[PDB]
Structure formats: structure tokens, C-alpha cells
Design a protein around this ligand. Structure first.
Ligand code: HEC
Ligand code: HEC
Ligand code: HEC
Ligand SMILES: [Cu+2]
Ligand SMILES: [Cu+2]
Ligand SMILES: [Cu+2]
Ligand SMILES: [Cu+2]
Ligand SMILES: [Cu+2]
Ligand SMILES: [Cu+2]
Lengths: 455, 455, 455
């Protein structure tokens, strides 16, 4: 059989698993070993977006699950534990396993139990693993997926950085950025109409202060998985090119491409060389996913500018919107304060500040000045101050036709922004009212709910 | 021109066409021939799922249509007959034909008529053929697609088994597994929201007793088509790897991959070597298709276990759900008995038995015992017996919070199963009531319809 | 760095940009140059379909935007102007640019302004460029995408014809072919449910008298982009095969394929050799896109028939429906006349004539004769004449069961055609009534609206 290099030798190895976005060290070994993998399923609430909770089902407490790294020809003794706090039974199917269910029938594990099975890793490559418990789509949609790397016997070529990025489509009862604990929505899942499309299980998991890092001149390998359950990723890096893309354990290697399709349940190894400094965006280039559902991750490159290659500026909020900033923690704080009934004006102002970036600043500017005659000012705006209820209607339903703001005529079009949630409109307008010599006061989520109910 | 090896020689050959999942023998020929292909369009009702009828439009009486096998450089004389019972006109477009419409303008055929056209098979490869009659999407959605293989002149490498598997997306007015004759739904088709995603034109067409077969050590070639009309298949084999994947007549061959994207209207040849015994599942890994819409097929491998490669068990209903069993004929029988007005308790019990597998057994076990303190028993359940109407509400709408069953406390969550149809809930609960010393009696589809109407 | 061949030499070149479907001449140069690209954003109403207006946002006044052609190693000085009539700010991200945002942060341009940035073209290949202004999906959905070709240093192999074809998905408030100025629909865009899927920004942009042309024996290169924003194209040529397909700047080249997947934001170079005369259809083979949403383009090959290769007829309206004809200008004229309140019977008749092709003629024939006993006549039809209101109901809601037409019995099924708009049903039936010795008169859109409101 391929990838059979004899029985295990040396000592049994306890696999060291890593949490995303990090990868275990290269196995750096010339002999086949018995590798003991211990993975524990944990069901738990986590933030899928600021102020939005979701009950994830996880391998190892993360989405995606712990990264497993072995060598082709290793005997893997796989232990799956199901934490006693679990409500569901779980199991595992690893791609790249040779045998029925990729482990599923022998890994069936009730809450508080443990199962084990053994397999030889015959197939080199990068592989998705996932839960295989009826209803299979529900388990995978709740975050039950990760990657296993089966190294070639000589190891992969040395790089400066290895990272772990996995896309998933998620199905909430509520709309995108609707606050609260969001249940799983089976109807959206069956229709393949996700509310979120994420890297590593949350909006902003790999942006701002959670960006991946490297330096000019360094090489980066990324193990990229698509857990699905349903979407195919038009996986793309903005402002850069992949030196190589290799799918699973495939013989074919594509070189010098920027855009590549990753099947549902598929995995690829990509390699990048950093040439110039700045933020490189990993996206699903089915563009409403990347810019309206959360499918964006950042690789931040530090080092010397090369004006002969690129004369231009670092990414800002015009392109990355509200993810240009280090974090949106102010949104989480305002949401918690609403729940507790302690929401202050300043809690709203700081949340609105975070959300104004891109969403409003692209036209009205970061300082609210606009552009005289083209985009009207929000800074010390007589039109804003004259009618705060009309301002709520303008955000939700748009504005067009001739208006006068601060003594100048505008005759343009502000598109409707009906996709903003009531708390988002309230916090943004509270921010604007409390900035730039505007009159202060506040807009409440209830205020906006009433305007939404009758335009 | 490529693939032109002179005029036809020998005798004219009458092509021998096969029904899925079988393929005609290798042409085994060193000379170009005149090949006469006779294909007849038949419109007819068939079971798309147990107790669910659909009017298919077929090439040769099957979905997918009869497999056509010729050699590169053959002159093909193509005869399309439209059966007199047909209501629609039909035609054909074969991929791999060199000429406008791939045959469409010269194959236009009214009910009870016959058309013919001739083409040289210049392009080697595996190709989709399909109907090309306005409205083209409706004809293809009704099952009007198949494969034509144009062998290379030296033939393909010898294998132990060749099979024919074709994916299709289907659009019923009714929901998944809603019983009766289901009309085509143009609105779902335009929106690309299929009710079924199938291999070979039915749920269970290639599962249980209709599985594909081979033995350990044997090689299997599968000609895989995607008739669409609309979906792209994340085509995957669970627990195995493809030795080779080749698309259409492409020069590129990918090797050692498990997951591959097949375009709408695309076709690939895959090759598999059986290493260990068990059931290998072919799926569209857009996972709600495979596990909620019917997109699963089985290759069953017989032979000696190899514990050094895989220590684990054969696939069961935890992963394959209600398709683990040889067939679900009891569902078809119960549906026919409802139509006739002769439905008995035992008809319901046998249907419920089939549907309980996976759907309920994953948590409550095949014997209804559950797991004390974790999953409550359905076997001799005081809680079930106390309130059969509450049991209908629990299946449709779920259950959570503290309950007492057979003297033990449970504090867990049973998800809602609202996607089950009224007859399915009725038959499952009738099965449970008539098993395991439960009190007997029955639940009717009308009973469940009323509970669904007011939770 | 790759593709760095020293500083620019010779004179600065002012790039000559072309409108689709044409491409600039090969750069035909042995030295790296400074290339000055000037591109202007124009927002403007254009016909997305006959009688259907849309406000496109364009690079250079077209969808897709002006084609840019440079050589690997050129220094590109990129000037983006935003026309003063613009309401939105715009920018650019070019795939294949090495640097953050592919130009986005340094190309931010308010109406009536100009921005510039410089980049070295290190990466050879074909690349999408698009707007990168929040909300990014809205800008791309409004048509803000095109192609840039970075030639290899020795140039591409010489061909007879080069063309420029780019797919896009579009999101109108109204349904497909609903007349009037159609606003952008953010809700459809987020759900990835386009109303139109087009080549080069309109239905019929590359059909009939706007077809691409070549002659038997000639080679055609097509630069194929997928602007998205959301869809993946199952890109296919009907009745022909691609000699080569190469994605972006990839090392891999696939040969001899008919069907290939182009990611959202992806681009490919395809090469075709014309073997026999006729119309070759480029489609997205997600078939409801091609035949129900506009995703069809034609390459028309003139020259000598080769009966040894293909004995069959040129494409007609059975396959291409209402796009078989040179244009559907009569629909545009009837729509304008309705708006003006000058709609005549003959305006309706000429519009109906155009729309009857395929839609009705596939069964009732181009002359309305039908096929005795199989498809009833519309020519001098007693059944039509007896009840014009019943004819409106038959088009919208279908007909089945026994009928008598012109003294012969029919017992067949005419499917419902509810997707036709009220003006389309009115114009088709006015055409039929005024043809073939039928009694004349007219059906109005208001007539059909009332029948639609109560079947
Ligand atoms: C450009 C695409 C804009 C974005 C994004 C947002 N706004 Fe806007 N806004 C814009 C225009 C062109 C106009 C004038 C419309 C016209 O009829 O000419 C406006 C107007 C407003 C107003 C009222 C006028 C004023 O006080 O300056 C308000 C209060 C306003 N806009 C607020 C606002 C907020 C809060 C935004 C993000 C949520 C936002 N706008 C986005 C253009 C654009
Ligand atoms: C796990 C994912 C389950 C599946 C699949 C099904 N059921 Fe279930 N069921 C489950 C739990 C954890 C509970 C207890 C909930 C709580 O509040 O603690 C239940 C409960 C029931 C009951 C009532 C209690 C009893 O009689 O044991 C019934 C009647 C029941 N479940 C039926 C049932 C059927 C018929 C199923 C398939 C259609 C099914 N359940 C699936 C967990 C799970
Ligand atoms: C085949 C797929 C058809 C298409 C496309 C259209 N029509 Fe049709 N039509 C068809 C049949 C088989 C029948 C008879 C149905 C039966 O019960 O046997 C009809 C009937 C009509 C009629 C009434 C009878 C007559 O006058 O001949 C009308 C007025 C009619 N059809 C019109 C019509 C138009 C305008 C179409 C395009 C919009 C059209 N039909 C499409 C079969 C088919
Ligand atoms: Cu699980
Ligand atoms: Cu899988
Ligand atoms: Cu047909
Ligand atoms: Cu086709
Ligand atoms: Cu723009
Ligand atoms: Cu892009």
C-alpha cells in the first residue's frame, strides 16, 4: 500500500495539538511512530460577533478545532472524549483516513464518554476532519470541523511562519449583527443562506489586533480549510499572489495565482512571500460574504516601503470598513450594558464611534466634515440638529433630492442602510450627536424600532 | 483536425447502450467505425423518494439517460426518437460534438417522430449530453441528461469495475419527502433552491441493496456526471481517496485527492483502489445536500479486514441515518396504503421502524433504551405513555428543561424536527408506541397536522 | 523580485484602453516602460434588457470597464478620475498589484476629483480589477469591474482574434424583464439571488447582430472575467472545445476542456480553433442563468460546411429562444411607446413577434400551425378567437385536458408561463391575434394584470 513504511518505531508520541491560528511544529522525524491523539468535544457559548452569542460545538474548545500534525505512515491511536456538560453525542470523520466513515462508526461518543480507534496515515496531505453525527449538517454548522496535516516523509519545505485559517458558513435565527444569543436556524441551513461566513469562528477573529503577522522578505504557509457545511470559497488574497496552492494530498500544484476555489469540505496549503509592507486581506471573493457577512482575515506585513513596487498607502476603513481598527470592543460593552440596563450615553458614543468607520466615514469623513457641495457635513450639522427623528429615517431609508446643510445646497443620493440593526443606528447617531459640537442627547434602539415600523 | 483517423472501416456498429449504474464494455477496436446510436425519449412517473412520485423526462427510460460509448475518430449516426406518449418536443446537445448546438438544431423531435444527425467524435473524453429544448432548464431539471464516453484510440487502462453515477438537482412543489405526485416548481428552479439533490434520479438509488460493489484489492473507475441544472458538486468519497481524477477530455490529471469540484454540466473519470472492506460514501460535500436532500451513494467493498490500516467498524445509521438499511420499502407500502384508505397500524409500525433509524436512534438508541441520565428512554417510557399529543409536539418543536422519565431526571435539549412531514412523525410515533412494551394505538398524519398548526 | 527587468526605458506610454468586447493590440515591446493609465468613473443609466433601465457605475462608461494591457515589469502610473456628475466616491483594487488593497487606499476619489498611484507589474497574467469602496458589494454589483492583462515579456502567441467577455450577477428590485428603471436590491444581493446574470452588462450584449465573429480555421483568444460579485461561473462553450484554459498568471494550463469553473473575482484566458461554421454559445452552465437570466454570448463562425465532421443545422430559436434573431429592438420601442402613452397595435405586434420566438414557437411553430393532434394551432385558431381572456389565463396558468381546436382533439399539457411579465403576455397575444387570419384587436398589460390577480 502507498505510505506504508513498516511498523511504528521509537517511543509512542503524545500529539501536541494547537489552537487556531497556530500550527504544531514540524514533526521532524525519519521513522514511523505510534501517535496518540486526544481530542475533547466541548459545547459552549462564544461571541460569533460583538454582542452576538452562539452555542458552538467544538473539537478542543475552538472553531476550527485543534490542528493535528502527523507523518505519512504513522499509526494514529485516536481518542475522542465528549465533555460531560455536552447535550449531544459526537463522533469524528477524518478526511485522509482509509476506512468506512473515516472513523465515524468507531468514534461514537455520548456525553461524559470516550471512544478510540486506530488508523494508519497512508495518505499525505492536508485534510478536513469533522463531526459525522446525525443530523450531520447541524453538527458541522455548529463549528465541528478542523484540519489534520499528514506530512510527507521528508517533511514540508521550511518557511518563516505557518498559520491555520478555516472558513465556515453559519446559520442564526437572527439577522447579521442582531444582538443576543442566536439559535441555530435549520431552515436557512437547508436553503444554504448563511447569516455569517467567517474565518476561525467569529467576525474579526483574524483582523485588527488578531491579525496574522510576518515581515518583508519572509515566507508564510497557510493551511486553509473550508468546513462548510455548504459554501464553496472563492478564496483570494487582496494585494498579493500565492507562490503555490496545493489541494489535500494532490500531485498537482498550481503556482502564481491570486484566486482559487476551495470545495465544501476541502483544504489547501498556500504559500506567500511578503514583498512590501501593509495589510493583505484573505477573503471569500463571493464579495457579499467578505464585506457583508464577516469573511475577511488579515496578514499584516511589517518592514521597509518599496516605492518602486508600490507607491500607495496602507489599507483603511474605505475598504476594510469597521474592521480597519484594532477591535470593536466598545460594541460588546454597549451590548452587555443594554442587557444589564446600565447603558450610558458614553457607552453608546464609543459603540457608535467603532461602527461609524467605513459605514458612514466613506462619504461623511472620519471627522464628519463631508466634502462641500458633494457630501454634506455631520460635523455641527444644522440639518441633523433640526430633526433627530428625520436622521433615523435617513439612515434606515436613505435620502435624495435637494437639501440645504450649513448654508450649502446638496442634490445627491444617500442609499438606504436598512441592514443596520436598531442598536447600531441608535449607537451611530448617538456618537454623531455627541461629536463635532452637535447638540448631544441620545437615540435609543426603541426610538429606531418605531421609525423602522413606519418609514 | 485532431482525432481524425480516416473514414469509417469494418461494418456499421449498432451501439449497445446501458442503464445506470452500468457502462457498456470497452469498444476494444483499432479502427474508426460508423456507430449507429438509437436513443428514445420517454416521459414517465417514477419514485423520486419512497411514496414520492415525479414525472421524469428521460433519455432511454432512466435518470441519468443511457450511457453511450464510442472511440475517438468514429462517425456517429445519432437517431433520437420521441415516444408517442410524450407531451413535449425534445432534442439533444452532446458535449464533445464539434458543431452548433452539439446536435440541437438537427435533433428537434415531436412526440411520435424521429430525427437523425451525423458527427465525427474528434474529442476524446467523458461528456455530458442533455436536452436543449426551450425552456432548457425545465427539460434538464426533469432528468434529461446522461454521459457519452469518447475513448482514446488505445482504450482506457483495464480496471475491475466501471460504474455510472450522475448528480442532479430537482425542484418539487412540495417539500423534501412530502408524499404524492410532485409537480416541477419553476420558482425554486430559477432561485437554484432544490428540494432534492440526487445521484441517479432517486433517493437511495445507490444505497443499501442498490449499492455499487467491489472487493478488496480491485480497481473501480466511475464516470461521474453533474447534470445540474444548477448546482456545482463538491464531489467527495468518505473514507477513501481517488487515485486519479480527470475532467472531460482534459490533458491535466489530478492524483491522490478526496474532494473535487464538478461544474454544472461537467463530467469526470475517477479511479479508486479498494484497500479495506466497508461502505465508501460518494457525496456532494455541500453537506445539507448529502444528508438532508438525498446526495449520497455507496460503494460497498467485501473482503478481509486490515486492522493495521483501520481498526474501526463498518458505517451504521449514526452517519448514514435511515439509508444504512437495505431499503425503506415499508415507507412506499404505507404511503400506497394511505392513498388506498387501507393503512393499518402494522403498515405504520414498519414505516416508522425504517424512519426511526438515525433520525431518532442516534440519541434514543435502536432499542429505545437511551442512556440513563443523558438520553431518556422511549422503551416502556412513562413520559411517552402519559401524553401522546405532547410526544407529537416534542418531535415537531423539540423539548428542553428538567423532565422525569422512568424515575430519572434529564436536563438536556432535544432539537426540533419540524422538517419531518406529518406522515413521518405519525409513522415514527406509531412504531415507538407499538414497540418496547409501550401501550400501542396509533398517531395519524391528521393528528400531527393539527399539532403543527398550533404548537 | 519576480518580473523586475530594471527601470523603465524608452518614452512614457499613454495606455490605449478598449471598450468590450475588443482588446488593445499586443504591446509588442522588448523593454520595460512607464505606462500612464487614465480611467474615468461614470455613473449612468443604460439598458440592462430591452425596456429595462439600470443605473450602472462604470470604469470608462462600459460594463465591464475599459481593458488595460501592459507588460510584466512595466511601471504603471494609474490615474483614476471620478466624473463630476457622480454621486458616490470610487476607488480601484487591481488583482495582480503587489501592495495593500491592490491600489484601494491611494485611489479614493470623490466626484470631480482625480487620484494617482504607481505600481510595478511584477505578476504576469489576466486579472480582475474592481471598485473597493464601502459598501464594496454594491459598487461591484453596479458594474464596477474589468480586466487588466500583464503580458509575459515575449508576448502571448499570435492569434486571429482577441475578445473581452466578463460575467456579472445583477440585483434589481423588479423581476427579470420587468420594465422601467430598476433600482439595486441589497436584499437579493446579500442572499446571492440575482435577477440577471449577464455577459458584458446587458441581455443580448453578445448575441444576434452583436455576436463575436471569426472564420473557419482561425484561432480566437477570449479574456474571460467573472466580476461577480457573488456567482461562480460553470463557464462552457456549446458545440466546441477550448484548446487551452489558463487562470490568472497560473503555471498550470488545462487543455481540451469544454466546461471550466471561474471563481468570483477570477479571470481566465481561453483559446478556441474554429472547425465548422455556425453559432458557438458561451454560457454559465448553471443552466437557469444561461436560459432564464441572460447568461449567453455568441461566437459566430463563417465558412465552408464540413459534413464529415457535423451534418447538422445552425442554431435556431428552439435552443437560443428569442436571442436567435439579430435584435429585439421592437421590445424597446413598445416599452418607450407605453411610457409616452402612444403604444399602437403594430408596436405591440412587433414586440410580440420578437418574444414569440422560442417561448411559444418551440411547440406552436414559427407560423402558428402546431402539429395536428400534438400541438394545437394558433394560426386561425377558433379556440383562441372564442375567448381572448381564456388565452391570457392559458399563458399565465397553463392548460391541460381534452380540448378541441379547429375540429381536432388535443389531450396534452401546456406548462404555465407565470414568469412572463404582463406587457410580455399582452404583446405576445396581440402579435398572435394580428397574425394568421386571427381576428385582430389587442390585449393590454392592464388586461393581463387583472387575470394574474385572479387565475
Ligand atoms: C455615501 C455613500 C454616503 C454614506 C455611506 C452615508 N451617507 Fe449620509 N448622506 C450622504 C449624502 C449624499 C447625503 C445628502 C443626500 C441628498 O439628498 O443630497 C447624506 C445625508 C445625510 C444626512 C442628512 C444631512 C446632513 O446632516 O449632513 C445625515 C444625518 C446622514 N447622511 C447620516 C449618515 C450616517 C449616520 C451614515 C452611516 C450610517 C451615512 N450618512 C452614510 C451620503 C452618504
Ligand atoms: C438527540 C439529538 C436526540 C434526537 C435525535 C431525538 N431526541 Fe428525543 N429526546 C432527546 C433528549 C435529550 C430528550 C430529553 C429533553 C430534556 O428536556 O431533557 C428527548 C426527549 C424525547 C421524548 C420525551 C421523553 C421520553 O419519553 O423519553 C420523546 C417522546 C422523544 N424524545 C422522542 C424522539 C423521537 C421520536 C425522535 C426522532 C423523531 C427523537 N426523540 C430524536 C434527544 C433526542
Ligand atoms: C409546449 C411546451 C408549448 C409551449 C412552449 C406553449 N404552448 Fe400553448 N399549448 C400547448 C399545448 C399542448 C396546448 C394544448 C393543451 C391541452 O389541454 O391539450 C396549448 C394550448 C394553447 C392555447 C389554446 C389552444 C389553441 O388556440 O391552439 C393557446 C392560446 C396557446 N397554447 C398559446 C401559447 C402561447 C401564446 C405560448 C407562448 C407564450 C405557448 N402557447 C407556449 C403547448 C405549448
Ligand atoms: Cu457532533
Ligand atoms: Cu467530510
Ligand atoms: Cu426535452
Ligand atoms: Cu450543455
Ligand atoms: Cu465604486
Ligand atoms: Cu478583488
Amino acid at each position: 500500500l502507498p505510505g506504508d513504511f513498516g511498523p511504528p518505531r521509537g517511543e509512542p508520541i503524545h500529539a501536541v495539538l494547537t489552537s487556531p491560528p497556530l500550527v504544531p511544529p514540524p514533526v521532524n522525524r525519519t521513522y514511523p511512530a505510534k501517535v496518540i491523539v486526544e481530542l475533547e468535544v466541548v459545547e459552549k457559548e462564544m461571541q460569533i460577533s460583538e454582542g452576538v452569542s452562539y452555542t458552538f460545538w467544538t473539537f478542543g474548545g475552538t472553531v476550527p478545532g485543534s490542528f493535528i500534525r502527523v507523518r505519512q505512515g504513522d499509526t494514529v491511536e485516536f481518542h475522542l472524549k465528549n465533555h460531560p456538560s455536552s447535550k449531544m453525542p459526537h463522533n469524528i470523520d477524518l478526511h485522509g483516513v482509509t476506512g468506512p466513515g473515516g472513523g465515524a462508526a468507531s468514534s461514537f461518543t455520548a456525553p461524559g464518554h470516550e471512544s478510540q480507534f486506530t488508523f494508519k496515515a497512508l495518505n499525505e496531505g492536508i485534510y478536513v476532519y469533522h463531526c459525522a453525527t446525525a443530523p450531520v449538517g447541524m453538527h458541522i454548522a455548529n463549528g465541528m470541523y478542523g484540519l489534520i496535516l499528514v506530512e510527507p516523509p521528508e517533511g514540508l519545505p521550511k518557511v518563516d511562519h505557518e498559520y491555520y485559517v478555516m472558513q465556515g458558513d453559519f446559520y442564526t435565527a437572527g439577522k447579521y449583527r442582531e444582538k443576543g444569543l442566536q439559535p441555530f436556524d435549520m431552515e436557512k441551513a437547508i436553503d444554504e443562506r448563511p447569516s455569517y461566513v467567517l474565518f476561525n469562528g467569529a467576525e474579526g477573529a483574524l483582523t485588527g489586533d488578531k491579525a496574522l503577522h510576518a515581515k518583508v522578505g519572509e515566507t508564510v504557509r497557510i493551511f486553509v480549510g473550508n468546513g462548510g457545511p455548504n459554501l464553496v470559497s472563492s478564496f483570494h488574497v487582496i494585494g498579493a499572489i500565492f507562490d503555490q496552492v496545493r489541494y489535500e494530498g494532490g500531485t498537482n500544484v498550481q503556482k502564481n495565482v491570486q484566486t482559487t476555489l476551495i470545495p465544501a469540505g476541502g483544504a489547501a496549503v498556500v504559500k506567500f512571500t511578503a514583498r512590501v509592507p501593509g495589510s493583505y486581506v484573505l477573503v471569500d471573493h463571493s464579495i457579499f460574504r467578505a464585506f457583508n457577512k464577516g469573511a475577511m482575515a488579515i496578514l499584516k506585513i511589517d518592514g521597509a516601503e518599496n516605492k518602486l513596487v508600490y507607491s500607495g498607502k496602507e489599507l483603511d476603513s474605505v475598504f476594510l470598513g469597521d474592521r480597519a481598527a484594532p477591535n470593536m470592543s466598545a460594541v460588546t460593552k454597549a451590548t452587555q450594558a443594554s442587557v444589564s440596563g446600565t447603558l450610558t450615553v458614553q457607552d453608546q458614543v464609543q459603540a457608535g464611534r467603532a461602527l461609524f468607520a467605513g459605514t458612514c466615514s466613506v462619504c461623511h469623513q472620519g471627522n464628519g466634515a463631508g466634502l462641500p457641495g458633494v457630501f454634506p457635513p455631520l460635523a455641527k450639522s444644522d440639518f441633523l440638529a433640526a430633526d433627530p427623528k428625520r436622521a433615523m429615517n435617513i439612515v434606515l431609508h436613505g435620502l435624495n433630492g435637494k437639501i440645504k446643510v450649513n448654508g450649502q445646497e446638496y442634490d445627491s443620493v444617500m442609499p438606504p442602510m436598512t441592514q443596520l440593526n436598531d442598536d447600531e443606528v441608535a449607537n451611530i447617531l448617538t456618537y454623531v450627536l455627541n461629536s463635532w459640537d452637535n447638540p448631544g442627547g441620545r437615540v435609543s434602539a426603541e426610538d429606531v424600532k418605531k421609525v423602522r415600523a413606519q418609514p
